[PDB]
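ERR on first pass: missing label on line 2. Operator R.T. fixed the label and resubmitted. Corrected input:
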Amino acid sequence: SLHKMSMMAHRVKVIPYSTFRLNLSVTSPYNADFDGDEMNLHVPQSEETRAELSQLCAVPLQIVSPQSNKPCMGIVQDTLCGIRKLTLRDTFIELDQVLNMLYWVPDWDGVIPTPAIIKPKPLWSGKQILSVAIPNGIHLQRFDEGTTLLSPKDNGMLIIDGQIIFGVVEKKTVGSSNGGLIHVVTREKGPQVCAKLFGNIQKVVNFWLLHNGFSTGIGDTIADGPTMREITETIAEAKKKVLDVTKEAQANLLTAKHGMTLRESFEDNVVRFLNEARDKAGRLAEVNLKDLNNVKQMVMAGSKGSFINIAQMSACVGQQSVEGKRIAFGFVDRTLPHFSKDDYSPESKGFVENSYLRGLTPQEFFFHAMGGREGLIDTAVKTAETGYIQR
Amino acid sequence: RGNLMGKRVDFSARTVISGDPNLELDQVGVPKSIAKTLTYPEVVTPYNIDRLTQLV
Amino acid sequence: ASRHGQKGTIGITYRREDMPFTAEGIVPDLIINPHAIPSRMTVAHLIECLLSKVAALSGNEGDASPFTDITVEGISKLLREHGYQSRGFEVMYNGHTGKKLMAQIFFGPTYYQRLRHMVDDKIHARARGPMQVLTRQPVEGRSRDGG
Amino acid sequence: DESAPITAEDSWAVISAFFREKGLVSQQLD
Amino acid sequence: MIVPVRCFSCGKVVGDKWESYLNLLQEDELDEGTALSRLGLKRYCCRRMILTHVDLIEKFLRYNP
Amino acid sequence: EEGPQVKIREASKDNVDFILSNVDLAMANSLRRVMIAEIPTLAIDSVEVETNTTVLADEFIAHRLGLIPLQSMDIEQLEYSRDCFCEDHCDKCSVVLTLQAFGESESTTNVYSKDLVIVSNLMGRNIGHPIIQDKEGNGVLICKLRKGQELKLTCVAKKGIAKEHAKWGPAAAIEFEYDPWNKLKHTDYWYEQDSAKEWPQSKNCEYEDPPNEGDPFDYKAQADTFYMNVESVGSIPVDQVVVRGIDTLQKKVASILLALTQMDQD
Amino acid sequence: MNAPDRFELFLLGEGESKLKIDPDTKAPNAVVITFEKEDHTLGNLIRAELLNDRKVLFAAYKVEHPFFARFKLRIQTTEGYDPKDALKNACNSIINKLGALKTNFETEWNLQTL
Amino acid sequence: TLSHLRRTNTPIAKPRQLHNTHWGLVCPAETPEGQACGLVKNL
Amino acid sequence: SNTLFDDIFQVSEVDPGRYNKVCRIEAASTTQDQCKLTLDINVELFPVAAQDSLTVTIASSLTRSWRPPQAGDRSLADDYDYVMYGTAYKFEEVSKDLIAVYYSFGGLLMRLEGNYRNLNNLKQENAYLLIRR
Amino acid sequence: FIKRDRMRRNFLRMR
Amino acid sequence: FIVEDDESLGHKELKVRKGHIAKLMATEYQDEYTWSSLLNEGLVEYIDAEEEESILIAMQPEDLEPAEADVDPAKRIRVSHHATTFTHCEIHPSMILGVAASIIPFPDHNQSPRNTYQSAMGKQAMGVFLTNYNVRMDTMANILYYPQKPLGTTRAMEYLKFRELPAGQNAIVAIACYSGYNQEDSMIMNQSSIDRGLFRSLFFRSYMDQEKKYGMSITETFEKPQRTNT
RNA sequence: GAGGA
Ligand SMILES: [Mg+2]
Ligand SMILES: [Zn+2]
Ligand SMILES: [Zn+2]
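pass 2 clean. output:
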């Protein structure tokens, strides 16, 4: 427990089925996931103890954390991913489903917002139905990057009442970000309203997602052919540049930049080339993905993953490294007996090239295993350190 | 550090957790059997005496 | 847990009808959330699901050995030949409404192993039970009614 | 032919020759 | 151990097909793809159930008592 | 008729395939789900393992016993145990089965469902004969016996529905589909290169004309004309399965109506 | 051991009369109805049926929590049309459709040889 | 069980690392991450 | 009440900007050379090409939880192939005589230019967009 | 491709 | 394996040839010519870490040394032969894995930490641990009801007898956001399918106890106690 | 020993 947030108060709902069940947004503060984690619950025994709890340590009070003066909770994976899709400009909702969604909001006043389209088929955009959850009065205008009051890319965000005007809801708006909606609603209407807000958004979006469904699969990671061989030739260019640097170095023509060894200069150059290559390929892959590609959606919504994961699952896992410098000659002058001696070519010193999709050749596999174990060790040590430091 | 700055206490319970999107943000779904065990001492006032009688 | 890294626990059980069902009437017995995948990059999980689907169709053994020459393309070709979407996606139907889902679903068999520590060995609650001798604080260990 | 070279597939035979005269706990016993 | 009845997901009874399945394999030399399809296991929710079964109860039956 | 039309494409011993048209999606789906879940039947429910020496744990065996389909055509003449006042079972609310097996042979002695024998009086109700779809004539393989192992127990079969426990399902997964051409656009096709090629078109696509691409998306249209296929586990004839599913659904709705009557009553 | 007994997924309780009417307050001529021991099976059916009606202004339902065999249903009619009446008519229409289907399928079933 | 019978320990230099020479002799993957990560090995 | 504004527009250009059912319409008022218009459309429900021609008026009449079009008494300005409803949210003034109005239709946006559109298009969440062929 | 257990016949037939 | 020259260093070669393979298979199917024989004829060779320092292994027999010689794009990027003076060829690379790792399908597509986690978890799985469990009397036995061999296997799993003592079942998994009840890991399991028996298991626990350890007259006895000043 | 996370 490294947080005041790690202990909070709750209202009890008694249910069957022995686990503790708890709302989903509250996971990030506790930093828990339901992969078998357990948490303890403490019962105050006296009047002012429980008064203390409900007045100081209750959850909604903790939405904004003093640690970084941004809210410490927010909307998360399933809901976060859905709410983006629901709120895209293309989405439209027929009547009956609209009615159900409304009824899911506990506080819905009982008024059916006029459909955004009354042309002969009454259609509601998603944004409207979402806006039903937002309490009146909020404003939250953002103008993300290129937004121009017509938001052709539909980015940015603009709400001029408890009612949203344009922009796709996503992490930067409804996540745990700084000027996010959660922030604003706290500051405006106090914790109870903010908590009710979490509840409403979750219920509506979950319902909609349930009836719209969303999945991902292997085909999501497959890049287009042309894109593939373009990636390949990009890697090839990288190899060539490395080779040229190498030939020059062995011709002793390499000029060591001041302040470092000739050998170090060369090694750094190679590493830089390889990383540039991996990222070039990563951008290629990412660009090629269509918008229906589910992984691209989990990224756009920011609920999971990051560009690097796309790069590794599709373009090139790229250099492995132990203690920053790449793989070292464990054997005499060669990383693995499968090589000659004094080979500095990228794969001889650990440049994994195939993607996780294509699988790794046994060398690459081993190299990657070395890198990964370094990762495990560092994590294990780092937690013990930071624990002692914090104490 | 083991018995004074922190100890082991009564009136507590521990279990696996599980997400749930139908719980209010501040709620928690304590499973029934647990609640059958943890207790809280009320004080009999005119406000509750009937209800407490029902409980007992 | 799957065979790669995905620890997981149950967390609700639906009757059969409520689960989504595909047109053939098959209904999964396990729904895992897609957000697991990209962060971890367990491609092999997807590939196994695909391959196993093909195997079960064709009555074979999925040769999942590591450093072979099996590719995804080959598996997919086979899968198409058995008459399914060549990447394992399947149109599925919402259980509650019976309506199609707007998004198709990755779907296939996959080997899952039941780990130990059922919860009944973790559930635990103390309400003033016995205490130690030395320090007269609550005893330790749930087996010993600890706090 | 019989002097013909070996395809990578064949190696599994060799492997099975091993593990027949070794078992998997060979070293403990040995 | 012994065959399960009733393919888990699908529900279709399969607890009877086991003998015939084995027969097809031995006497008809048939290929288990076609063997399954012969027994009628169309969808893989049942094909899995049979194809991958493991019949340990044999090896249980060899302890004398 | 004025409501739904049924056109049976094909009927077998265990399957009907039929087109369900001029209905609403909700009615269809509810029918689907009730057939899966709520139509009652008969199944083993309690086992008195008087003796067992096999290599199988009892509750294991009792479990397998639960799953054995039983002749349950006229189940209606039977009463839910929670309704029969008798001390836990009688002949109005239960059927007693029994089982003895012994490894007389030297080779393995199989124990098949067909070895089950009814004891309780059926009162002439076509109930409880274990269903034998097997061509060889012996039903499910319950257990195997080596030589001296003897298994001898008695069972009770009771009326129940799949909601309580799947063993009561005459279910046998049901197929279901509509708008095979996706004219309703109720779904959108993930695809790498072309939705048309990459998606294997359904076998029902023929029963409806392909969309003419030169037509605007009709938004007025709604989903009727569902292609359904019902497979029956065998405890009930397939036609009986769908008929009783319909009837059960109707009964529960009528029950709602009656509750309304009670409310308006007082 | 905290599992609820499964028979109460269809068994009315003690005072758990199948229904429980409640006048809504948020809007006029509206009502909220609770069904015990039910689920989408009945809900979604009735709901769509209501939606068919012309004098119904609003109709939706929800299963609050899957652990529980309930679902609330909320009706709202135009004036001069009691909600419980709209409910009655929806039930009757559904029953008639079911009866038709039953006979028709029985017919077409006799249409077979197997 | 099988894995147990082929385990391997090291008491107490970067011994937790995965050295190249482990190639083919020690499983590059299996190791009880935790305090003992890298020490306990398997053949 | 009535037409708050009326006109017709030659659709200069239509773009399906990364969307399926929605395209951004570019049209100029044939009449007022200084009147132009940008608009999103559910083209799936209302197909449009270039040089096409549309449905007219910025109405305001034909609170009050929207009721299904109970087609006993459905007599609005129900005379068009397209009827959207939405809110003004900025009245930015392009020039001394060029006022632009920004409407949002549940996320579908629209923008107009001129000055004779004078303060009859005032800040009104109410507006039922149409403009003719 | 898949793992084939029919190769026992292959050698037995090939022998 | 032991690389060698032949008529040529071309057409350099594993010493072992298809004839020996045939003999091996024959011995295998005889159920005469065993691995030890391979040893004596000097086709295979024992190599330790020290000696490894001075050899030149080839990964795959054929492609690594056929000769110096259109490619399936899906196939990974193998490097080349690129060298000539090999001296040994790996038997099969998948043998660098240990036992636990050999269970994983396609571990060459996973991120290594994932492999490690699986290697750790695999030792928790329920499954049949021994064929005679019902005779052993030990603490804490867990036995699956209806194990199943996996559909996706690896060659090595044959040698671990895994497909005869499997430790899990093949579930029909579906990857989807269904009702948010399965996010932030796991998941939803089909209840009815459970009733069918999915993932059921047996648990056995053994309690031991004996008569008095000590006390000449202090002699603990087994019997049914009563209120006999007990 | 165990050990989950
Ligand atoms: Mg965790
Ligand atoms: Zn099945
Ligand atoms: Zn009785």
